[PDB]
Design a protein around this ligand. Sequence first.
Ligand SMILES: NC(=O)c1ccc[n+]([C@@H]2O[C@H](COP(=O)([O-])OP(=O)(O)OC[C@H]3O[C@@H](n4cnc5c(N)ncnc54)[C@H](O)[C@@H]3O)[C@@H](O)[C@H]2O)c1
Length: 165
Amino acid sequence: MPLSNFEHKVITECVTIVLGDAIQVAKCYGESVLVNAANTHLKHGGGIAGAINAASKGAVQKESDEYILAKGPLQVGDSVLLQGHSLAKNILHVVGPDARAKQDVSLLSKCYKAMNAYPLVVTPLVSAGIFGVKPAVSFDYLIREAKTRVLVVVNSQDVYKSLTI
Ligand SMILES: NC(=O)c1ccc[n+]([C@@H]2O[C@H](COP(=O)([O-])OP(=O)(O)OC[C@H]3O[C@@H](n4cnc5c(N)ncnc54)[C@H](O)[C@@H]3O)[C@@H](O)[C@H]2O)c1
């Protein structure tokens, strides 16, 4: 019954769209991997990254800073699996393309392919916020790649209605 707490629509046997807060959806599933829409330096200053960090009481940012100091920054399209900090089994930090910087939007395919390593994924629409890709487009890239159970969570009802109309 976790999804009974949320308005949702099953799109395929893999992909379901959910209206609400991705952090709250992931909290319902102890085995879920929660996707963070991150940047190359894992600086979680706002958006869902800032919300995930706040939910972790700052531990996500502290762990991110340790990682980037040791490994250097990530490339657009990369992903790194880090701790879940009781929000989820793990948090998959994914570096979506920033359309403001005219980065290759097709790198969203590489972002979403990375989700297929995990049996249950809870994800926002990567690059669909400040990175300037329309949610409708980010969704196209997601459904093209998803091979595992993915709960796509959108926190705007206008977006939810648009993707389920
Ligand atoms: N004020 C800031 O500094 C600020 C603000 C936003 C994003 N960022 C940074 O931008 C980068 C990511 O940009 P982006 O466009 O890929 O992602 P984003 O987090 O800006 O937006 C991705 C999509 O998820 C939606 N969303 C936000 N919170 C959600 C939640 N709890 N549950 C479900 N959906 C949610 C957003 O409205 C958007 O449609 C990150 O590094 C983030 O730190 C910084």
